[PDB]
Amino acid sequence: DIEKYVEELYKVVKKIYEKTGTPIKFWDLVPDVEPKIIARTFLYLLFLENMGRVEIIQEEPFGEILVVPM
């Protein structure tokens, strides 16, 4: 379900951060390169931010998107 895809994506963010100690690039978070997949990943991150699970960082409009787990 959707309740799962979000929890998995969160674990993926946590795991990477637990090793790099630096904000994750949105790109390295999107599996396949297709509008449908990109947007779904984007959407889930938005959901995780609402949940106070992650923090999304962007310096300028349409600029690079970075993610940091809470």
Partner: protein, 323 residues
């Protein structure tokens, strides 16, 4: 003209820090969870373009639009929205590649406006807007519940809408001219939105238009008529959308704002509607608030809305540059 961006400061749920919301020249989908502040972006646009009805912007009174503070932020001192219009097509009677309108309201309800830096009056802003043919509350703005309106709308109200779009002895000829066009657009667009079906616009008094209303005759999936009042939510939505698009195909408004107009559409209809929005994106700008994967996956750019302890924020993504 078309909206390049909006900047909010102390407006509703967006807190104090300036929030920059950019828009695609074409199709932008505004997404995010329930209660994130998505519809507030639509209210922001109603606000800058001179909106006067607190209720229309989901507020008890105008001052209610001022961010009231949160866990990490204090009550804003005022609510402000600035909208940036690309004016390369010179739609505005201003010889500048960028028109900027800004409205601010204080706790006492007093609003102040500015046009390209110089302060203007509300009337002046409306005149410049009508001049660019931008309706703050025209048929081009479809908020939640506006579809149950294009449906409940009386035949006279509906024809009056066309009178307006036609531009007011030989006036019958002008009206008929634009009516014949929009009617054709409606039939073509509906057939495409409802495969195997058809629909058309009909004047009650075709010989003397202004003495009667403008009705809708729909044959959804078959060749059998069916009062629009008797359709279900889904078909009503499609029908209203076919009408809205039939108008835009004839006279493209600078921009269209849709707030969850796909709430009652099945996935195949979200797809057809999404494709119609893209194709229409070439002549007008479309800002669409949606909760549907299908609608979102079809937009040029996406504006993601999220909260943070009662405070809204956005993140902009370009599906093109994302490739």
């Amino acid at each position: 003209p078309y909206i390049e961006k909006l900047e909010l400061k102390g407006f509703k749920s967006y807190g104090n820090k300036k929030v920059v919301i950019p828009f695609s020249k074409g199709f932008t989908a505004i997404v995010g969870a329930n209660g994130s502040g998505k519809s507030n972006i639509g209210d922001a646009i109603l606000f800058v373009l001179g909106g006067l009805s607190a209720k229309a912007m989901r507020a008890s009174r105008i001052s209610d639009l001022i961010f009231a503070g949160s866990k990490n932020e204090p009550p804003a001192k005022y609510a402000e929205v600035a909208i940036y219009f690309n004016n390369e097509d010179r739609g505005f009677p201003i010889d500048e590649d960028e028109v900027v309108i800004r409205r601010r309201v204080y706790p006492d309800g007093r609003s102040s406006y500015w046009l390209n830096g110089r302060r203007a009056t509300r009337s002046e802003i409306l005149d410049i807007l009508t001049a660019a043919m931008i309706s703050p509350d025209g048929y081009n703005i479809v908020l939640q519940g506006d579809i149950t309106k294009f449906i409940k709308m009386s035949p006279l109200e509906r024809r009056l809408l066309i009178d307006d779009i036609s531009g007011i002895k030989e006036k019958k000829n002008v009206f008929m001219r634009t009516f014949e066009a929009i009617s054709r657009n409606f039939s073509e667009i509906f057939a495409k939105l409802s495969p195997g079906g058809s629909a058309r616009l009909i004047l009650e008094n075709p010989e003397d238009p202004f003495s009667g209303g403008l009705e809708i005759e729909a044959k959804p999936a078959g060749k059998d008529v069916k009062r629009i009042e008797a359709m279900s939510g889904g078909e009503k939505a499609l029908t209203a959308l076919a009408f809205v698009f039939a108008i835009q195909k004839f006279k493209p408004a600078p921009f269209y704002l849709f707030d969850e107009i796909d709430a009652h559409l099945d996935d195949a209809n979200v797809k057809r509607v999404a494709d119609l929005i893209k194709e229409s994106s070439k002549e007008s700008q479309f800002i669409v608030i949606t909760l549907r994967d299908v609608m979102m996956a079809n937009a040029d750019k996406i504006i993601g809305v999220s909260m943070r302890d009662g405070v809204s924020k956005v993140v902009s993504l370009s599906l093109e540059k994302a490739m």
